[PDB]
Amino acid sequence: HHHHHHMVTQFKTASEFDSAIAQDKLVVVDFYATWCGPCKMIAPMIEKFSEQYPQADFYKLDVDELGDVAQKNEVSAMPTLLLFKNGKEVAKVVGANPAAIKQAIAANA
Ligand SMILES: [Zn+2]
Ligand SMILES: [Zn+2]
Ligand SMILES: [Zn+2]
């Protein structure tokens, strides 16, 4: 019954980031870079999760484009999946293990 899609939306600016995470719902943010190997390896999992948890909003952020947002959120390892609810970080999953990311989403959705 794949009658519609959910997307992993790319943040354009810091202000869109700030507003998006303010919501009263799980917001999942994949911090990546085009140079990042493990990020590409986990991209497929994150896309699938976005359509597995339609009650959460999924986004991605290119640290080459919004390195400032990355700096404010203390993202260093890559990929980093940051999860927020009501303006507050609720998980910070570091690295490329799909199992941990899945546990974190399931915990917070
Ligand atoms: Zn149907
Ligand atoms: Zn789809
Ligand atoms: Zn749906």
Experimental method: X-ray
Q: Which ligand is nearest to the CA of 3?
A: 1
Ligand 3: centre distance to CA 5 (Å) = 6
Q: How many angstroms is the resolution?
A: 1.8
Asked if residue 80 lies in contact with residue 94, where contact means CB atoms within 8 angstroms, the answer is: yes
SS (H, E, C) 25-72: CCEEEEEECCCCHHHHHHHHHHHHHHHHCCCCEEEEEECCCCHHHHHH
Ligand 1: centre distance to CA 4 (Å) = 10
Catalytic residues: 36, 39
Name the helix (H) or strand (E) containing 82: strand 80-85
Query: Which residue, 64, 101, 69, is CA-closest to 83?
Result: 101
Residues 44-49: contacts with CB under 8 Å, at least 24 apart: 45/98, 45/101, 45/102, 46/8, 46/81, 46/101, 47/8, 49/101, 49/102, 49/105
Angle in degrees, 0-180, between the axes of helices 98-108 and 37-52, rounded to the nearest 10: 30
* CA–CA separation, 58 and 83 (whole Å): 9
What is the assigned CATH class of domain 1-109? alpha beta
Give the Cα-Cα-Cα angle 103, 28, 20 (nearest 5 degrees).
Answer: 155
- What are residue 92's DSSP bridge partners? 82
The 10 Å Cβ neighbour count of residue 86 is: 12
Ligand 3: centre distance to CA 68 (Å) = 32
- Ligand 2 (ion): residues with CB under 5 Å are 5
For CA atoms 20, 85, 14, 44, the dihedral sign is: negative
